[PDB]
Structure formats: C-alpha cells, structure tokens
Design an enzyme around this catalytic site. Structure first.
Site, PDB file in Angstrom:
ATOM      1  N   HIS B  97       0.740  -1.259   0.000  1.00 52.99           N
ATOM      2  CA  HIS B  97       0.000   0.000   0.000  1.00 52.99           C
ATOM      3  C   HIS B  97       0.777   1.323   0.000  1.00 52.99           C
ATOM      4  O   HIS B  97       0.165   2.388  -0.139  1.00 52.99           O
ATOM      5  CB  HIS B  97      -1.007  -0.004   1.158  1.00 52.99           C
ATOM      6  CG  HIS B  97      -2.363   0.508   0.779  1.00 52.99           C
ATOM      7  ND1 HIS B  97      -3.486   0.284   1.546  1.00 52.99           N
ATOM      8  CD2 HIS B  97      -2.775   1.235  -0.287  1.00 52.99           C
ATOM      9  CE1 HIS B  97      -4.531   0.851   0.971  1.00 52.99           C
ATOM     10  NE2 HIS B  97      -4.126   1.435  -0.142  1.00 52.99           N
ATOM     11  N   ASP B 120      -9.853  -0.454   4.288  1.00 48.38           N
ATOM     12  CA  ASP B 120      -8.675  -1.024   4.921  1.00 48.38           C
ATOM     13  C   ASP B 120      -8.944  -1.336   6.393  1.00 48.38           C
ATOM     14  O   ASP B 120      -9.829  -0.740   7.007  1.00 48.38           O
ATOM     15  CB  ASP B 120      -7.584   0.041   4.833  1.00 48.38           C
ATOM     16  CG  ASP B 120      -6.185  -0.516   4.931  1.00 48.38           C
ATOM     17  OD1 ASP B 120      -5.944  -1.460   5.706  1.00 48.38           O
ATOM     18  OD2 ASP B 120      -5.312   0.033   4.233  1.00 48.38           O
ATOM     19  N   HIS B 122      -6.606  -0.841   8.385  1.00 46.24           N
ATOM     20  CA  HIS B 122      -5.726   0.198   8.927  1.00 46.24           C
ATOM     21  C   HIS B 122      -5.937   1.550   8.249  1.00 46.24           C
ATOM     22  O   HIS B 122      -6.454   1.627   7.136  1.00 46.24           O
ATOM     23  CB  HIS B 122      -4.261  -0.208   8.747  1.00 46.24           C
ATOM     24  CG  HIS B 122      -3.972  -1.621   9.138  1.00 46.24           C
ATOM     25  ND1 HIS B 122      -4.119  -2.680   8.269  1.00 46.24           N
ATOM     26  CD2 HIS B 122      -3.569  -2.152  10.316  1.00 46.24           C
ATOM     27  CE1 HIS B 122      -3.819  -3.804   8.895  1.00 46.24           C
ATOM     28  NE2 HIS B 122      -3.484  -3.510  10.138  1.00 46.24           N
ATOM     29  N   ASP B 124      -3.320   3.682   7.745  1.00 47.63           N
ATOM     30  CA  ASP B 124      -2.078   3.980   7.028  1.00 47.63           C
ATOM     31  C   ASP B 124      -1.804   5.475   6.998  1.00 47.63           C
ATOM     32  O   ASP B 124      -1.411   6.028   5.966  1.00 47.63           O
ATOM     33  CB  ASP B 124      -2.144   3.471   5.587  1.00 47.63           C
ATOM     34  CG  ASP B 124      -2.312   1.976   5.506  1.00 47.63           C
ATOM     35  OD1 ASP B 124      -2.090   1.283   6.525  1.00 47.63           O
ATOM     36  OD2 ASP B 124      -2.656   1.504   4.407  1.00 47.63           O
ATOM     37  N   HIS B 137       4.228   1.325   4.270  1.00 43.34           N
ATOM     38  CA  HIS B 137       2.864   1.033   3.824  1.00 43.34           C
ATOM     39  C   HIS B 137       1.881   1.451   4.926  1.00 43.34           C
ATOM     40  O   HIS B 137       0.667   1.374   4.752  1.00 43.34           O
ATOM     41  CB  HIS B 137       2.674  -0.457   3.457  1.00 43.34           C
ATOM     42  CG  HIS B 137       2.597  -1.390   4.632  1.00 43.34           C
ATOM     43  ND1 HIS B 137       2.042  -2.652   4.538  1.00 43.34           N
ATOM     44  CD2 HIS B 137       3.040  -1.272   5.907  1.00 43.34           C
ATOM     45  CE1 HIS B 137       2.148  -3.268   5.701  1.00 43.34           C
ATOM     46  NE2 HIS B 137       2.749  -2.453   6.548  1.00 43.34           N
ATOM     47  N   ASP B 228      -7.382  -2.069   0.169  1.00 43.67           N
ATOM     48  CA  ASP B 228      -6.387  -2.939   0.785  1.00 43.67           C
ATOM     49  C   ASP B 228      -7.169  -4.217   1.053  1.00 43.67           C
ATOM     50  O   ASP B 228      -8.202  -4.188   1.734  1.00 43.67           O
ATOM     51  CB  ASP B 228      -5.902  -2.347   2.105  1.00 43.67           C
ATOM     52  CG  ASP B 228      -4.871  -3.221   2.805  1.00 43.67           C
ATOM     53  OD1 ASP B 228      -4.834  -4.447   2.562  1.00 43.67           O
ATOM     54  OD2 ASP B 228      -4.103  -2.673   3.625  1.00 43.67           O
ATOM     55  N   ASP B 230      -6.716  -6.501   3.069  1.00 43.48           N
ATOM     56  CA  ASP B 230      -6.862  -6.890   4.466  1.00 43.48           C
ATOM     57  C   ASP B 230      -8.012  -6.129   5.137  1.00 43.48           C
ATOM     58  O   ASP B 230      -8.228  -6.225   6.347  1.00 43.48           O
ATOM     59  CB  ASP B 230      -5.539  -6.733   5.239  1.00 43.48           C
ATOM     60  CG  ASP B 230      -5.160  -5.291   5.521  1.00 43.48           C
ATOM     61  OD1 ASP B 230      -3.970  -5.081   5.835  1.00 43.48           O
ATOM     62  OD2 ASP B 230      -6.018  -4.379   5.459  1.00 43.48           O
ATOM     63  N   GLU B 273      -1.963  -5.141  -1.296  1.00 39.42           N
ATOM     64  CA  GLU B 273      -1.576  -6.095  -0.259  1.00 39.42           C
ATOM     65  C   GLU B 273      -1.838  -7.590  -0.482  1.00 39.42           C
ATOM     66  O   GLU B 273      -1.829  -8.367   0.475  1.00 39.42           O
ATOM     67  CB  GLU B 273      -2.158  -5.658   1.091  1.00 39.42           C
ATOM     68  CG  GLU B 273      -1.737  -4.249   1.533  1.00 39.42           C
ATOM     69  CD  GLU B 273      -0.245  -4.108   1.827  1.00 39.42           C
ATOM     70  OE1 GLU B 273       0.474  -5.130   1.850  1.00 39.42           O
ATOM     71  OE2 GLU B 273       0.212  -2.966   2.049  1.00 39.42           O
TER      72      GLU B 273
HETATM   73  N1  LIG Z   1      -0.332  -1.116   6.429  1.00 41.07           N
HETATM   74  C1  LIG Z   1      -0.246  -1.605   7.791  1.00 41.07           C
HETATM   75  C2  LIG Z   1       0.242  -0.598   8.757  1.00 41.07           C
HETATM   76  C3  LIG Z   1       0.298  -1.274  10.145  1.00 41.07           C
HETATM   77  C4  LIG Z   1       0.794  -0.409  11.283  1.00 41.07           C
HETATM   78  N2  LIG Z   1      -0.202   0.614  11.623  1.00 41.07           N
HETATM   79  C5  LIG Z   1       2.085   0.361  10.851  1.00 41.07           C
HETATM   80  O1  LIG Z   1       2.157   1.605  10.827  1.00 41.07           O
HETATM   81  O2  LIG Z   1       3.094  -0.366  10.510  1.00 41.07           O
HETATM   82 MN   LIG Z   2      -3.328  -0.469   3.696  1.00 41.17          MN
HETATM   83 MN   LIG Z   3      -4.231  -2.821   5.873  1.00 40.22          MN
END
Ligand SMILES: NCCC[C@H](N)C(=O)O
Ligand SMILES: [Mn+2]
Ligand SMILES: [Mn+2]
Ligand SMILES: NCCC[C@H](N)C(=O)O
Ligand SMILES: NCCC[C@H](N)C(=O)O
Ligand SMILES: [Mn+2]
Ligand SMILES: [Mn+2]
Ligand SMILES: [Mn+2]
Ligand SMILES: [Mn+2]
Lengths: 315, 315, 315
Positions: B97, B120, B122, B124, B137, B228, B230, B273
């Site tokens: 991502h 997502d 998350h 990000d 990502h 994403d 996930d 992803e």
């Molecule tokens: N794309 C996943 C990110 C996961 C976690 N918040 C990070 O900043 O690594």
């Molecule tokens: Mn993502």
């Molecule tokens: Mn994600």
C-alpha cells in the site's frame, strides 16, 4: 479511570464437563492482565478462589452437585462484594455459568439498583423443578429473580441465597436454544430479550440501543454483564460445553461490549464457559481464548476505531 | 463505457514481507483481464512497472527503504497520470500500500478535485515520526494530506511529493487496528471514517449512502478507491501481510464496490496487499486472489442481481 | 395445527450430477419426521415417488432429459395436489429444482391464488431457448409464468404443463448468479427480487417485511416456499451442485422461514438441491443435511427464542 478487580473462579460442578475450571488459567496465561494494564486500566488481582472439595454431595432430586455449586457461589458472592466495596469493577473469570448466582448476588449487596445484560445462547433460567438436565449452570437466573420466589425449593447449599433482581432488570441477547419451561417463564414474567431472531431482524446496533434504553431509560444505574462465551458462534468460541450454531459474530460480540463500555456504567463482568479441554485442536483453544480476551478488553475501553492518550501526538 | 488502464506495480519495500510484489502476476494469471473484457470493458494493459533496484537505501531514522519506496511511487504517479490523460480508469495491481502515494498523486495531477475512499483494516496515516514499525505502507496517507504539511520531515526519495488531498476529501471504511498517533490525527483533522464499529451499528447499506453523500453531496467529482485486501476478513483474504480478525465480509466487500460502480464516478482504483507467499495453503492463495478479482470485477459493472446487454433476449 | 404431507422426490435428471436423488434418504435418515413430530406437528408420509426410468430421452435441441424431467414433475404435480386436497402443507424433499414445475403446478390446481417465495442463488428462469447449459433445473420458473407463454417451445414431456403464476406472484431472495437472458426477463416482466445486494443494503429483516407485504398486501393467500439449499452460503450447505460464494447466512436462512411460519400461510414447501455425493468430507454432508433440516423445522414452528405448549410450566 476504569479500575478492575480480577477474580478467578475455577469451578465446573454446575455442569458435567471438566476443563472449564481451567478458564482462569488460560485467560491469564493469554496475558489478560498485561493487556488490560496496556490500556487505561488500574488492575488489581484478587487471585483464584480456592473452592474446597465437597465429597458428599448427592443430587437433590435430579439437581446435580447442589452443595458444591451453592458453596462456590456463596464464596464468590463474598469476594465480589469485597471488590465492589473497594470501588472496582469486578471481573470474574469462570468457570461454568452457575457462578452467576454468586457474582450477581455479591454485586447486588453493594449495588442493589443494578441492571443485568445476559449474553448467551441460553437463558439459564430453569428452576430446580423445570430442569431436565439437572445441571446448575442452566438454572442460575431462576435463583436470582424475586418473582420466581416460591417456585425455588430448598436446595442444599443455597439457603444463603436471596433473590436480588426483578424480571424487569435483565435483558437477554443471543438466545437460540431455550427450553420449553424457560420460554414459558420468559413470556409469563415479561422478560426483555433479543433472541438471534431479533438480532437478525433489527441488527446489533438497534438491539443495543434498545437494551441500554430499556435498562437506563428511567435512570442510570450500575450494569452487570454476564457473558457466556457460547453466546458467540462456535466458529469463534468452539472450546465451550454447550455450543449452538447460528450465534453472535465476533464483530457483534465486540459491538455489544464497546457500547456497554461507552455508557461508563459497567460495574460487574463475568466471562464464562471457556473450556480449554473441549477444543478439537490446539488452534480451537487459542481461537476461543483469544476471542474471550478481545471481548474483555472491549469492555474496558479498547475501541476498533482506535484509542489515544490525552496528549498531542503531532506536537 | 468503462475503459480501464491496467498498471502492474510489483513492489514490496513499503513493508517487510516479500511475495506481495507477486500480486500483479497472480491476479493476471487468474484471468483478470479476460474476465474484465468478458464484461462491458475496454481494457488497455500498460504492463508491469519495472522498479529498478536501489541497493543503497539505509533507513531514515526508523523509516525503512525510503528511497526505494519514494522512487516506486514517483514512477507509478507518472504512469497513472498518463493513463488518466488517456481517458481511462487507472487500475493499479499491487504491491504493498505505500504505492498509494504514487497512485493518488498521479491521479490528482489530472483530476485535482478527486475524492478518496479507503477500504482497509488500517488507516495507514502514520507520519515518519509517529510510526513505530518504520514500514512505509503504514504512512502513505500522511504524505498526501495538505494539513499534515509541516509534520512530514524531508525523507529521502519523497522530495517530489506535494500533498494533494484535504482531510475532508477522504473516507475510511473497515478500520479495526489503528495506532494511537493515527487515532489522534483522525480526531484532530476531523477525518470521516466508518470503523468496523460503525459498520456493525449502521449496516453497510447506510455506511455507503453516507460515504457517497459525504464526498459527492456538494458536487460530483472523480472517485479514487484504494482497496487494501486486508480490509476484508482473513477468512476471505488470508494471504496478506497484516491480517486482522473481524473484518468486512465478502458480501460487504462486493456491496461497497457495486455501489461505487453505480455512481459512474470511479476514476482510480488500487487493489493492494495481495501476498501469495503468505497463504498457509494453496487454497488460501486462490481464495485470496479469487476474492480480489471479484472485488475488481464489481468495481467495473458486475452485479450480483445479474447483467445483460442492450438487446432483446426473448425476441 | 400444522399438518404436513411428506413427499420424497428422488430425482436428478434436471441437472448433470447424480447423488441429489439421495436427498430424501439423507434428510429422512437425519430424523426429519421424528423431529417434526417432536414439535406441534401432524405428519403424514406419502413416501418416495417412484420415478420410472425413461431410457429413450435424447435432448430437445440442447435441453437435456426433457421426457424424464417432464414426467417426474407431472407425477409430483399429481401427488402434491392430492396432499393439498387432504388439507396438508405439502413438503417435497428433492431432488433437483426442476421438480418445482410439478410442485408449484400441483399446488396451484388446488390453490390458484398462491404466491411464491423463491430462495436461491439462481433465478432458474431460463427458457429452453435462453439456456446455455441445457440443464432443466435452471428453467423451472419459465415453464410456470403465464407471461412467458409463447416463448416456451413444445418440449417433449411437458405438454401437460399450463403456466399457473404471473410475474407479480413471485419474489426471489438470495440471487447472486443470474444469466444474461434471465436478467433480461427479470427486468422486462418487472419481477420482484432481493438479490444478495438488496439483502446487504436493507438487511434480512426489511427484506422479509417487503417480501410478505408485496405478496400479502392486497390480500392473504397460500404461500409456496421453494427453497434451494444453494441459496445459503456454501459454508453452511456445501453438498450441493451449483454452489456460489457470498450467500445467505444460517441465521438469515432461519429468519426467512421463521417469518414465513409466523404468517400462518405456508401452504407448500420445497427443500431442493441437497446432494450428499458432493460433500468433500463426511462432515460437509452432515453440515448440509443438518442445515436443511433446521430450515425445514423453522418453517413449521421451531423458533430460536423458544417454544412451549399451552400449559402452565410453573404450576
Ligand atoms: N499497512 C499496515 C500498517 C500497520 C501499522 N499501523 C504500521 O504503521 O506499521
Ligand atoms: Mn493499507
Ligand atoms: Mn491494511
Ligand atoms: N447453560 C446451559 C444450559 C442448557 C440447558 N438449557 C440446561 O438447562 O441444561
Ligand atoms: N439451477 C442452476 C441453474 C444454473 C444456470 N443458470 C443454468 O441455467 O444452468
Ligand atoms: Mn450458554
Ligand atoms: Mn450460560
Ligand atoms: Mn440454485
Ligand atoms: Mn434452484
């Protein structure tokens, strides 16, 4: 600030299957205290209650292990009242659900105006006379309802019990396996419930709005959440004694608890029926325990949208 | 007529796990182009971007592979702007991502009034200073927000970046694992989001109504969907680097995209992803890829109720 | 009092895969009659229809086994009319879905004002001329619609058929794999349907409210529920010939039927496409059969909130 009072209740005689008395051990081992402290939590561990053995405990009619069950709840009731008196949210790690008799009894001694939310696939409201299994984890609620006084015979081990809740102070969520006598009691006492049929119809969002409005509408008061892990679908909590398909999802489980947390009124919590011995695979055990932990963490603040301290993260 | 511009982006340095750079290969192999053409689609393949190797790329503070990540996005940004200039909906096959920086940047060069929907688990949105993992990502959005200008240090490889979106031009859907600093930013910038809690509460139907109304209410404008995989539950997309339980269902995934398609405003799409190497079994890989393809096909017209050409089938 | 007339229909020639003719056997073996009697049910078993062999049955154009399919439905139609004349809810255990031609035809002879609810992943409304598979289990509805008269050629084995329902007397629920010609017919005849997209959007609660209101709004009339087990997600009913992912949940399946039961208007029921031979494991077979039984029991009164006789359980 959410201060918690941990109470391990390694008890299994409210039902046939052993292994559920290991619930406190597996949950703790999963880092439950550590993760709670990882949040905004003030955690005090009161330890595991030592439920002395009662070798002489023949059935009362068909009711099994009455003195063992009765004593364990009496002990737990005392411990819970102590934690409440210390100004902490009691967190009981079960153990089978018969323990709800002690947990809700002790909680009510300190907070008589409490309201109960019962998440379960079952109503556990059989009386010693309507039960067909004789397993006491299927009768806790009958011992607690004031309206059912007169229908509860003098069962050995429960002379200390005094019904502390009315039919109107409890809401069920997740029902999908209710016995005939139990259904009769539901309809006769006018008990509020959201079976899986109501959750499907209304959605968990409206279910929670109605549940809290029903219990907190007239006025605010302490909430007691008795969460039986078999309330959630077996795909999420397989290691349990009485699983029933078509249960609450992982998401709905977290929604219920996130919403309860947001009220700021959670006063007592029960995490029951986790039986590590019933996991068909090592993964089924961790899946069950991990979900039980997640539910617990949500009750104390963990939100899926995220959490942050009262600080400026960008500065 | 929905004309598409395919862009393979075999990149993985925005995170630790290799294998995600194989995403374009597995999706294509799954017949993605053929099936798209099987629909009402005009498909042009721009190929896979050749992300030259950058051997010398030490971390910037804790931020890993900054020059590699920065260059890949810069390249992708150029390719996406080219596809848009050709009047085609850019379809970026990831790849991790972090590529969203390039994809959304290049898209905005041609369509500055774009609105972004981010599906997502998350957000990000970590900045190079709030991140704890250092994985890029988990920071793409911070580089794109105009409001976060001043909080983004000069990271090697991103001098070409110019924030192109405001806090008000993006909506999140599916959140369930948000970092503390990230949550702070969400609440501080007033970013619109529908975490899993909101989806449970409102239902995916109302979530989409509100999402589109929020972005298209004042006026219509191009939509950029950064998906994403996930974001969907691991039971549907297990072969991914950062899976989180309690995700969006297969059905909700298709609903989001069917609704976006119906707007007729889809302008840019990211499918990110997908990591074939992380499938615990060959079936987990196909399950993941098959779902990713399904989501993609829905974005371009495939409806569950059915589809038919402008002809009389009965005659 | 809900009196039932059981009709086993061990037939499979409406499609390629054998094993579906074993549906009546596995369901019965699962204790379906016993469990029905365990409820408030008056059960009469009319046995399994003996579908004599028709060795000479070459395709009509591309339509396969027309005479076999036609004869089986003609026989079933007669049996169903007999059960209805006996004042019982006909319960047809399939068998492939081509049997719906006979079931709905025979039902309409006794109750011409019937309304049909079709739970399925497919519309099964292809005509002998729009079908690409030639499998008759994908064409039953076309033979039944009065509006499609003129589009149905004289197929050997179906000269006895007389369309008995109008486009306005049927509602589809669960659609997710509809052929182009089929979609054309849906939109052209104005057929009411709730594809998986509508279920996601509205929720199963509103879907059922609208379905019953649509069919019973003007006036009450007998309901015919043709339930194809592949309407439910393959995670619940894997042992079936044409499974499609993203289906109705176990819960939604029970909701649909609980709501239909509550109308007191269920007049005819079909439980189709259960194929024990297609279970990838012994467990997939029992999972499929157990779910099919559950759906059936809900149609006849079994409620998740519980059931109790007209007696005082506390006394
Ligand atoms: N794309 C996943 C990110 C996961 C976690 N918040 C990070 O900043 O690594
Ligand atoms: Mn993502
Ligand atoms: Mn994600
Ligand atoms: N806690 C499960 C109770 C199950 C059954 N209703 C019983 O009374 O044994
Ligand atoms: N009952 C399944 C039918 C599947 C496909 N639409 C066909 O016409 O064969
Ligand atoms: Mn239970
Ligand atoms: Mn219980
Ligand atoms: Mn079907
Ligand atoms: Mn069918």
């Amino acid at each position: 600030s959410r201060t918690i009072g941990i109470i391990g209740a390694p008890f299994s005689k409210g039902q046939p299957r052993g292994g559920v008395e290991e619930g406190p051990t597996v949950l703790r081992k999963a880092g439950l205290l550590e993760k709670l402290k990882e949040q905004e939590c003030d955690v005090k561990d009161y330890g595991d209650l030592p439920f002395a053995d009662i070798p002489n405990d023949s059935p009362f009619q068909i009711v099994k292990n009455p003195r063992s069950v009765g004593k364990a709840s009496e002990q737990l009731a005392g411990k819970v009242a102590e934690v409440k008196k210390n100004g902490r949210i009691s967190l009981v790690l079960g153990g089978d659900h018969s323990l709800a008799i002690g947990s809700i009894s002790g909680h009510a001694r300190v907070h008589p105006d409490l309201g109960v939310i019962w998440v379960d696939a079952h109503t556990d409201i059989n009386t010693p006379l309507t039960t067909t299994s004789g397993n006491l984890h299927g009768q806790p609620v009958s011992f607690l309802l004031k309206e059912l006084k007169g229908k509860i015979p003098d069962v050995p081990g429960f002379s200390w019990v005094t019904p502390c809740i009315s039919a109107k102070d409890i809401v069920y969520i997740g029902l999908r396996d209710v016995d005939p006598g139990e259904h009769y009691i539901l309809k006769t006492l006018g008990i509020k419930y959201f079976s899986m049929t109501e959750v499907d119809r209304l959605g968990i969002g409206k279910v929670m709005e109605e549940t809290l409005s029903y219990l907190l509408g007239r006025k605010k008061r302490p909430i007691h959440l008795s969460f039986d892990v078999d309330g959630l679908d077996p795909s999420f909590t397989p290691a349990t004694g009485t699983p029933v398909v078509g249960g609450l999802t992982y998401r709905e489980g977290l929604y219920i608890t996130e919403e309860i947390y947001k009220t700021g009124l959670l006063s007592g919590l029960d995490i029951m029926e986790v039986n590590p011995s019933l996991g068909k695979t090592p993964e089924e055990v961790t899946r069950t325990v991990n979900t039980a932990v997640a539910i617990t963490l949500a009750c104390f603040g963990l939100a899926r949208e995220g959490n942050h301290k009262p600080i400026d993260y960008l500065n």
